[PDB]
Structure 1
Amino acid sequence: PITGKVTAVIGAIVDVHFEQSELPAILNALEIKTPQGKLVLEVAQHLGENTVRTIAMDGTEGLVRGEKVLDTGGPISVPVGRETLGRIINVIGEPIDERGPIKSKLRKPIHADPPSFAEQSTSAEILETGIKVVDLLAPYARGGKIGLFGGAGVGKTVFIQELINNIAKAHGGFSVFTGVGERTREGNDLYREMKETGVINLEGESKVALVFGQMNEPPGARARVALTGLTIAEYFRDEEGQDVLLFIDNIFRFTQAGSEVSALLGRIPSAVGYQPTLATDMGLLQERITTTKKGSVTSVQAVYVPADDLTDPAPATTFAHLDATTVLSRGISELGIYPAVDPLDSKSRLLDAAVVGQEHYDVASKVQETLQTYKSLQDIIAILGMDELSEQDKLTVERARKIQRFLSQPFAVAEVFTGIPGKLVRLKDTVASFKAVLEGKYDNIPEHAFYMVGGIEDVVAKAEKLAA
């Protein structure tokens, strides 16, 4: 056997001395018997002569040196199946929703390798979203990273609730929402709402699976929660060919967590207080988001600022890998736009013309252009007077204000919030609707008739009713 007694506890960095000629491998999971259960510590270096140096994942309240250790022989393995959907699971894969033990099918290590060069996104293609705004100005792809911007309460919670609904309708797909630096008090509030709104049902099958980052637990476990979720998504992807959505909260706490563990391992943190392994830690996580031969994960990550700037090492490295931005703004949410997306900072580089179609590109560029001309003229027009308008100008004022209102689409999930039963609007209906406003066939139609409506079909009704 490979067993060894604990011989140090500097920090939460536990050095365990093993029997002569037998020692673990790096990235192994060690199990330590205690009056607290177990501590699952993950080996990150050998010191040699059958000694190791590990990191902690479960908290450390004090440890008697002379405790027995058991080497499992490989990395910590988290459950997979449709028996884990709708249950909050910690880093080692155990319930923290307190509905007590949960069933499982297979267990699979949280470290897996990027898929082959055969099983890649060799072609960008469009993943349809229930939100018309998304589908125009930054349409979603398959094996894509789409980086959400802004904080929490900025329109954040509703954007996330909608997506979980869309995917399921769209294919029959699932989600796993991971939160890193999720506050334990707030996560309860969210879980209670998610249950009410039908994105967590209490059957064995649900939509979204929840994986949460407990800040009262070590830094190693903040960093590894991300990989715990990635693994459940990947099973669905590999063996049932389901398309999934893996959400992250703070990618800020991913970086903070990861640095603390380097610092603890002695690897020099210089270059703006960030770890040297920054590029590769990302590279591993994000190359496991790809299209294979059956399934394709697709990912919404959230960027949250690290010292009131974006020039710092952690944003830049996140950004490089990105392919779209969706830019939720609190100001825009206060004006009662759902989605809260800022329609001039929503961008995609998969908005080419042979990926998205030649037509979809034309509609979308005019939409940007119309609002861009509108906002700039309005600056000095407001002040000087709105009787200083030209014939050219007031066609633009007309088109822009009517488009802006039209952006507000209730969602089924935010039915309570917005006040209207939700809509879902798909790739055909985004082009057709926004196209018509451009040819000004719906400029004889009030603005209270573009409020809380979806694509072209829906808005026919409103024009009649306003008058009635």
Structure 2
Amino acid sequence: AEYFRDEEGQDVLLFIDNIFRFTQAGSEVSALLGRIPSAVGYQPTLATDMGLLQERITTTKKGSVTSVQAVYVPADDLTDPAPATTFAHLDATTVLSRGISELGIYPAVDPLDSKSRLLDAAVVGQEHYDVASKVQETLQTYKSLQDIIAILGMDELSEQDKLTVERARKIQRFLSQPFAVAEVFTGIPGKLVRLKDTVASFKAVLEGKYDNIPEHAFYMVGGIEDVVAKAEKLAA
């Protein structure tokens, strides 16, 4: 990577599946070396060894390198020292969790455990941020009330909460997007939506303008236009 960035002076990309194996490999060697474990088995030279790597993928005036890293985690504990210190050296993250895979919604990136420094009101527009803001709020209310919902019905719940929830369930299912490289697996032909298109589709859907048609119309389809087509399909 360094040779492309520098010598040929071209921008690069990097993929790793999985870079957890890198921290794991250290911990194995560490014991025998004469070093003693830092906490829960892992090498005490963990912080330094992560650090050096993530500064050597860095962005200069000679090339800038966009990276995609897949971190493996045992039983999804993220309070552990190895997943945790990587998140600081990442400007944006897309935490992928088991629940959203059980919901039958691939992709499985959690929407409520996502962060970005790339999402601002002038980095991608004021408008882009306000459409994303509203998605974030809606699902966080819907989660707040999962307890209450289960304990008692929605007729014993508030009418106001029920709008947020009804919006939120539809918005969760809408997040889905079958893939054209796992067309087989998904069971549905792949779809793609542009960045510009994506905001628009979510903007409308939030204001109630396309909440009134099935929650399965939003399951496993891409942008807004695919949902309207799937409704026709459903209707027959």
State TM-score, norm by structure 1: 0.45
Q: Are 2:136 and 1:396 aligned?
A: no
Give the direction of change, closer, same or farther, for the CA distance of 1:269–1:307 in structure 2 (3 Å limit).
farther
Give the direction of change, closer, same or farther, for the CA distance of 1:390–1:241 in structure 2 (3 Å limit).
farther
Give the direction of change, closer, same or farther, for the CA distance of 1:243–1:415 in structure 2 (3 Å limit).
farther
Asked which structure has the greater CA Rg, the reply is 1
Q: What is the Cα deviation at residue 467 of structure 1? A: 3.0
Percent of pairs with identical residues: 100
Q: What is the Cα deviation at residue 454 of structure 1? A: 1.5
Give the direction of change, closer, same or farther, for the CA distance of 1:242–1:337 in structure 2 (3 Å limit).
farther
Give the direction of change, closer, same or farther, for the CA distance of 1:303–1:463 in structure 2 (3 Å limit).
same
Q: Are 2:32 and 1:260 aligned?
A: no
| Partner SS for 1:365 | helix
Structure number having the greater helix percentage: 2
Asked whether the equivalents of residues 401 and 447 of structure 1 are also in contact (C-alpha less than 8 Å), the reply is: yes
Q: What is the Cα deviation at residue 332 of structure 1? A: 1.9
Q: What is the Cα deviation at residue 275 of structure 1? A: 3.7
Give the direction of change, closer, same or farther, for the CA distance of 1:243–1:418 in structure 2 (3 Å limit).
farther
| Partner SS for 1:337 | coil
| Partner SS for 2:208 | coil
Distance (Å, rounded) in 1 between the aligned partners of 2:74 and 2:216: 40
Give the direction of change, closer, same or farther, for the CA distance of 1:241–1:424 in structure 2 (3 Å limit).
farther
Q: What is the Cα deviation at residue 349 of structure 1? A: 3.1
Structure number having the greater strand percentage: 1
Give the direction of change, closer, same or farther, for the CA distance of 1:267–1:404 in structure 2 (3 Å limit).
closer
Q: What is the Cα deviation at residue 265 of structure 1? A: 5.2
Give the direction of change, closer, same or farther, for the CA distance of 1:286–1:392 in structure 2 (3 Å limit).
same
In the TM superposition, 1:27-426 aligns within 5 A as 233-238=1-6, 244-261=12-29, 266=34, 270=38, 273-293=41-61, 295-305=63-73, 309-426=77-194
Q: What is the Cα deviation at residue 268 of structure 1? A: 5.7
Distance (Å, rounded) in 2 between the aligned partners of 1:378 and 1:246: 39
| Partner SS for 1:346 | strand
Q: What is the Cα deviation at residue 274 of structure 1? A: 4.1
Q: What is the Cα deviation at residue 466 of structure 1? A: 3.1
Q: What is the Cα deviation at residue 374 of structure 1? A: 1.7
Asked whether the equivalents of residues 234 and 297 of structure 1 are also in contact (C-alpha less than 8 Å), the reply is: no
Could you list the per-position Cα deviations for residues 267-306 of structure 1 after superposition, in whole angstroms to 9, with x for gaps in the alignment?
A: 5655654444333322221112233456432223233346
Q: What is the Cα deviation at residue 363 of structure 1? A: 1.1
Give the direction of change, closer, same or farther, for the CA distance of 1:289–1:355 in structure 2 (3 Å limit).
farther
Q: What is the Cα deviation at residue 445 of structure 1? A: 2.1
Give the direction of change, closer, same or farther, for the CA distance of 1:379–1:316 in structure 2 (3 Å limit).
closer
Asked whether the equivalents of residues 371 and 400 of structure 1 are also in contact (C-alpha less than 8 Å), the reply is: yes
Asked whether the equivalents of residues 105 and 219 of structure 2 are also in contact (C-alpha less than 8 Å), the reply is: no
Q: What is the Cα deviation at residue 308 of structure 1? A: 7.4
Asked whether the equivalents of residues 87 and 93 of structure 2 are also in contact (C-alpha less than 8 Å), the reply is: no
Distance (Å, rounded) in 1 between the aligned partners of 2:205 and 2:143: 17
Give the direction of change, closer, same or farther, for the CA distance of 1:242–1:443 in structure 2 (3 Å limit).
farther
Q: What is the Cα deviation at residue 440 of structure 1? A: 0.9
Q: What is the Cα deviation at residue 260 of structure 1? A: 4.7
Q: What is the Cα deviation at residue 309 of structure 1? A: 4.5
Give the direction of change, closer, same or farther, for the CA distance of 1:417–1:244 in structure 2 (3 Å limit).
farther
| Partner SS for 1:457 | helix
Distance (Å, rounded) in 2 between the aligned partners of 1:270 and 1:463: 55
Q: What is the Cα deviation at residue 381 of structure 1? A: 2.6
Give the direction of change, closer, same or farther, for the CA distance of 1:405–1:242 in structure 2 (3 Å limit).
farther
Give the direction of change, closer, same or farther, for the CA distance of 1:415–1:295 in structure 2 (3 Å limit).
farther
State TM-score, norm by structure 2: 0.83
Asked whether the equivalents of residues 4 and 11 of structure 2 are also in contact (C-alpha less than 8 Å), the reply is: yes
Distance (Å, rounded) in 2 between the aligned partners of 1:453 and 1:284: 41
Distance (Å, rounded) in 1 between the aligned partners of 2:186 and 2:77: 33
Higher mean C-alpha displacement, 435-444 vs 458-467: 458-467
Give the direction of change, closer, same or farther, for the CA distance of 1:446–1:238 in structure 2 (3 Å limit).
farther
Q: What is the Cα deviation at residue 394 of structure 1? A: 2.6
Instruction: List alignment gaps of at least 5 residues for structure 2.
Output: none
Higher mean C-alpha displacement, 361-370 vs 323-332: 323-332
* CA RMSD in angstroms, aligned pairs only: 2.9
| Partner SS for 2:94 | strand
Could you list the per-position Cα deviations for residues 144-172 of structure 1 after superposition, in whole angstroms to 9, with x for gaps in the alignment?
A: xxxxxxxxxxxxxxxxxxxxxxxxxxxxx
Q: What is the Cα deviation at residue 399 of structure 1? A: 1.1
Could you list the per-position Cα deviations for residues 415-457 of structure 1 after superposition, in whole angstroms to 9, with x for gaps in the alignment?
A: 1111222111121122111111111100122222212221234
Give the direction of change, closer, same or farther, for the CA distance of 1:263–1:373 in structure 2 (3 Å limit).
closer
- Count of aligned pairs between the two proteins: 236
Higher mean C-alpha displacement, 274-283 vs 393-402: 274-283
Give the direction of change, closer, same or farther, for the CA distance of 1:359–1:267 in structure 2 (3 Å limit).
same
Asked whether the equivalents of residues 432 and 455 of structure 1 are also in contact (C-alpha less than 8 Å), the reply is: no
Distance (Å, rounded) in 1 between the aligned partners of 2:158 and 2:14: 49
Q: What is the Cα deviation at residue 370 of structure 1? A: 0.8
| Partner SS for 2:212 | coil
